[PDB]
Amino acid sequence: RPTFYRQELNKTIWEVPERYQNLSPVGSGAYGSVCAAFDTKTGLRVAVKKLSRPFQSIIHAKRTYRELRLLKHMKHENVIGLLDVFTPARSLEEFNDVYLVTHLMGADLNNILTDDHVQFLIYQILRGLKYIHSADIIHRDLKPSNLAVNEDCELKILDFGLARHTDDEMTGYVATRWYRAPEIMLNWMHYNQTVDIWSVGCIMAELLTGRTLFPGTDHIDQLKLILRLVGTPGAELLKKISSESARNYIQSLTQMPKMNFANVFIGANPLAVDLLEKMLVLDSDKRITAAQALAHAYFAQYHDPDDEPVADPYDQSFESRDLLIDEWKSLTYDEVISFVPPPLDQEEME
Ligand SMILES: Cc1ccc(C(=O)Nc2ccon2)cc1-n1cnc2ccc(N3CCN(C)CC3)cc2c1=O
Numbered sequence: 001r002p003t004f005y006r007q008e009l010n011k012t013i014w015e016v017p018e019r020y021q022n023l024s025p026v027g028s029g030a031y032g033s034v035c036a037a038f039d040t041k042t043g044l045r046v047a048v049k050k051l052s053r054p055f056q057s058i059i060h061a062k063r064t065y066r067e068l069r070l071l072k073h074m075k076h077e078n079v080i081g082l083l084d085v086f087t088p089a090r091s092l093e094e095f096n097d098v099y100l101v102t103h104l105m106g107a108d109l110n111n112i113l114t115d116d117h118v119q120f121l122i123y124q125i126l127r128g129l130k131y132i133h134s135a136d137i138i139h140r141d142l143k144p145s146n147l148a149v150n151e152d153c154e155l156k157i158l159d160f161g162l163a164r165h166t167d168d169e170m171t172g173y174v175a176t177r178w179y180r181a182p183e184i185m186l187n188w189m190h191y192n193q194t195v196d197i198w199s200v201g202c203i204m205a206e207l208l209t210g211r212t213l214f215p216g217t218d219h220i221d222q223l224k225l226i227l228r229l230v231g232t233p234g235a236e237l238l239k240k241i242s243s244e245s246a247r248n249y250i251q252s253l254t255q256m257p258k259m260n261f262a263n264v265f266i267g268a269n270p271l272a273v274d275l276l277e278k279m280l281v282l283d284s285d286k287r288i289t290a291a292q293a294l295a296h297a298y299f300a301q302y303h304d305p306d307d308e309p310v311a312d313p314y315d316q317s318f319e320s321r322d323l324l325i326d327e328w329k330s331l332t333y334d335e336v337i338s339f340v341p342p343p344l345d346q347e348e349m350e
């Protein structure tokens with residue numbers, strides 16, 4: 001077993017293998033504090049997340065399990081993956097902390113553009129997304145602050161699959177209103193993987209212009225900003241809306257005409273405008289997928305059929321179960337114990 005050592009870092013206690021050194025806080029990640037550390041084994045820079053009370057509830061306990069399963073399965077250049085997972089506990093009985101270890105990317109899209117930067121970054125998200133969609137995992141809260149980038153403009157999607165699946169459960173996850181597909185914000189028609197595509201739309205809009213496409217102050221104001229752009233639904237979308245109150249807001253908010261996207265994103269690449277038009281549609285049945293977007297003319301430069309791979313079969317039947325905290329805790333632990341690092345060959349990265 002590793003030699004562990006201890007320190008207090010902004011009112012928390014971290015106990016970590018001696019192999020990670022120079023722990024340096026960088027703010028909150030999903031469900032805990034994050035530290036930059038140097039990884040003496042590999043020479044790599046890494047991010048270490050201490051989960052905050054991973055098992056104070058079924059909510060915490062299930063979510064910890066979820067995160068670790070997700071991380072363990074993702075093996076794709078544009079999707080954040082699991083570099084290491086550890087706990088100081090030497091047995092199940094005093095298993096109380098989980099720390100997750102990933103690569104440390106310079107920054108994120110929230111921090112950090114010419115068209116060619118835009119093609120490349122969006123291309124990467126879409127490549128990454130295709131991989132998650134194919135394993136039937138939906139991000140559900142894609143946004144600039146969970147898109148980590150190098151100084152090479154290389155990109156890795158973080159925090160996918162944490163946001164609540166339904167009305168009926170809570171995961172303690174905070175989404176950001178501005179990038180959410182209308183249909184998952186208002187729960188107003190059925191929803192599929194292309195909720196992420198809507199988010200990719202809002203992001204790509206934002207990169208080209210510098211401006212938040214829809215900075216809504218609440219659910220209704222947001223709906224208003226959206227419909228000013230895409231235009232109030234016709235009969236054809238309306239008939240797909242279950243919620244009668246969701247229809248009233250639409251038919252009542254003075255009928256907004258769809259705008260010319262060329263006027264809205266002026267001076268942008270026209271192929272860039274056309275992909276936005278295929279991405280920013282209300283009807284989630286007609287929205288372009290990750291895989292179909294990959295083949296859009298706009299990515300003619302970065303596109304390659306045989307180098308946009310898809311995930312292995314992912315078991316997520318755990319998502320349907322009601323179990324005690326002690327059952328989630330044990331399952332997480334066995335996942336910890338079974339964990340084998342990624343293959344580290346003779347080559348030196350970063
Ligand atoms: C360390 C880490 C662990 C896991 C995940 C993750 O995505 N888990 C899941 C769960 C389901 O799918 N993916 C992400 C990270 N991770 C990695 N790198 C990071 C780098 C910087 C930051 N900081 C950046 C600056 N912010 C102010 C605070 C957050 C934060 C991170 C950051 O959180």
Ligand SMILES: [Cl-]
Pocket residue numbers: 139140141142143179180195196199
């Ligand atoms: Cl999303």
